[PDB]
């Protein structure tokens, strides 16, 4: 097995500014050469060590023939730095931002964020981690040896053409169920192998698939100890037998290495439309851990951090967002899927869900024009994305109850809100799981309703607006996303 790659950790130079170049180039998957992209690389980019309260500047240089963005997924920073409208870097271009970090130590990432292009630009290889350190977490004595017992694990699926090149297509099927493939890339590698000390192994897991949700576990069923979520540490470690992770979410887990017993990290088959076709019908290996006589470094504390109380939940401005996949898109996408893969497709959510004759006929009558441009078929609140109108203005420094509905379709909708770390009160109609009570920047929405308590501490204008979107990328690209603004009330 090939040895797992470790993204270069990236602090500042004499001038506290990090340099990131957005290039293309070549990578090799199972001996077939493909064209891939990357931040300071052929592939996937680096880990940007940031230090809370101490700011740094980032020059972003774009050596693609085409344009792209750079979203700091998980950061509490003004809508300026994201950019939004005219936050676009044109080919050969420069952009410079400053990141004054103010949020607890956390494992965030960055990825291209342009409505219409995110799906493909990500699929190409653009990704990259941000590692935030505060003083609290250093005083903690977690495993700290980057690339040894503290390991980024970026897990992604891709599909490849006959050529060995990446095969993306934003057709009506991938706009419906997502772009998903058959080859699983752990930090870019296929089934790599990592060499761990005996002791605790810290793994910063990141689901970077386009639509594929993952569900981590170990080949031999040792528990994973979750110690942090999207936005930072949990209060105490949550012991779990399996860890489902959605697109763009991160969890830092600890695992125990004792004997020379090797064992794989695996992702278990998941109850999601189109994600339990072979080879993901069965448990699938993410990477193999092999223990050797390397130095260990950390412990599994019984407390990790303090977490503030929640403010009384009335008086709080409340906003309902209702996600909606245009029903024609659903019917059609599922036809493409039910043809291509037999009925091994819907396996996992395959049961009594049906659709009446009256619904079918009302669908017929409704697109009498035969005008069905599926590039706006996904909507929040009834209308798809238009950069022109931020949907609303929410208050700075103020607590608010956002309620995201997803009733009417059974399509997974991991829902992302920029410029904040928030807390989940309801996640798809149930109270959040023990480890998703933390800080999160993504919420499951699958046929039901979630409610999050959110507060933005950073200004964002119509010019550079915050977003909110499904992080199933092909949904975000085909309309399921809005903008919003935040300013200190006049």
């Amino acid at each position: 097995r090939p040895t797992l790659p470790i993204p270069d950790l990236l602090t500042t130079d004499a001038r506290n500014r990090i340099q990131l170049t957005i290039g293309a180039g070549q990578s090799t998957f199972g001996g077939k050469t493909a064209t891939t992209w990357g931040y300071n690389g052929n592939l996937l980019g680096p880990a940007v060590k940031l230090q809370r309260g101490k700011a740094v500047t980032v020059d972003i240089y774009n050596q693609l023939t085409e344009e792209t963005t750079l979203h700091w997924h998980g950061l509490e920073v003004p809508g300026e730095v994201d950019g939004g409208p005219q936050g676009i870097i044109p080919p050969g271009g420069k952009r410079s931002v400053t990141l004054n970090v103010d949020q607890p130590a956390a494992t965030c990432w960055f990825h291209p964020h342009q409505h219409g292009k995110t799906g493909r630009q990500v699929a190409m290889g653009l990704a990259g981690l941000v590692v935030i350190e505060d003083d609290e977490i250093l005083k903690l004595m977690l495993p700290k040896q980057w690339g040894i017992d503290d390991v980024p694990v970026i897990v992604q699926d891709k599909k490849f053409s006959a050529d060995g090149q990446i095969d993306y297509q934003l057709d009506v099927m991938t706009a419906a169920v997502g772009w998903f493939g058959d080859t699983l890339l752990t930090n870019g590698a296929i089934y790599p192998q990592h060499a761990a000390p005996r002791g605790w192994l810290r793994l910063r897991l990141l689901n970077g698939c386009n639509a594929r949700s993952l569900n981590f576990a170990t080949s031999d069923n040792r528990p994973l100890y979750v110690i942090a979520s999207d936005g930072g540490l949990l209060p105490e470690p949550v012991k779990v037998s399996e860890l489902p992770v959605l697109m763009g979410e991160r969890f830092e887990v600890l695992v125990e290495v004792n004997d020379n017993k090797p064992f794989d990290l695996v992702t278990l088959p998941v109850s999601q439309m189109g994600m339990a076709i072979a080879p993901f019908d069965k448990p699938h290996p993410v990477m193999r851990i092999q223990p050797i006589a390397i130095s260990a470094s950390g412990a599994l504390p019984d407390t990790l951090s303090s977490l503030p109380a929640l403010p009384s939940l009335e008086g709080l401005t409340v906003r309902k967002l209702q996600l909606s996949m245009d029903p024609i898109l659903d019917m059609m996408g599922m036809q493409m899927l039910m043809e291509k893969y037999g009925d091994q497709a819907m396996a996992g959510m395959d049961h009594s869900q049906m659709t009446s004759f009256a619904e079918y006929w009302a669908l017929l009558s409704m697109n009498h024009g035969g005008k069905f441009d599926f590039h706006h078929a996904n909507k929040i609140n009834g209308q798809a994305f238009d950069m022109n109108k931020p949907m609303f203005a929410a208050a700075k420094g103020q607590y608010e109850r956002w309620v995201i509905s997803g009733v009417g379709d059974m399509m997974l909708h991991p829902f992302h809100i920029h410029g904040t770390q928030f807390r989940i009160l309801s996640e798809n109609g149930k109270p959040p799981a023990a480890h998703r009570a933390g800080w999160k920047d993504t919420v499951k929405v699958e046929g039901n309703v979630s409610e999050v308590l959110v507060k933005f501490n950073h200004d964002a204008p119509k010019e550079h607006a915050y977003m909110a979107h499904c992080h199933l990328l092909e949904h975000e690209d085909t309309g399921m996303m809005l903008g919003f603004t935040v300013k200190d009330p006049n």
Partner: protein, 87 residues
């Protein structure tokens, strides 16, 4: 919107459910037609995008014994054959 005149046999099928007019809008035909199918059991209880008209008057109208309420443009072309568009 769009206003139309049902050719004879379609008009016949249209009044079997309670229509009375001689010149309808499109949404009006779609309504009464779906009403006809759901009154005469014509869909299959299990797969109910599937309409079985072989032995019915609708079978002669459309010229088939079956069709699927998913193939929209096809069912529209069958509908428009028995129409005279007035605009």
């Amino acid at each position: 919107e769009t206003l139309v005149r049902p050719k004879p046999l379609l008009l016949k099928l249209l009044k079997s459910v309670g229509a009375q007019k001689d010149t309808y809008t499109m949404k009006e035909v779609l309504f009464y037609l779906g009403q006809y199918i759901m009154t005469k059991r014509l869909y299959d209880e299990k797969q109910q995008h599937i309409v079985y008209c072989s032995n019915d008057l609708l079978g002669d109208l459309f010229g088939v014994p079956s069709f699927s309420v998913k193939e929209h443009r096809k069912i529209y072309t069958m509908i428009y054959r028995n129409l005279v568009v007035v605009n």
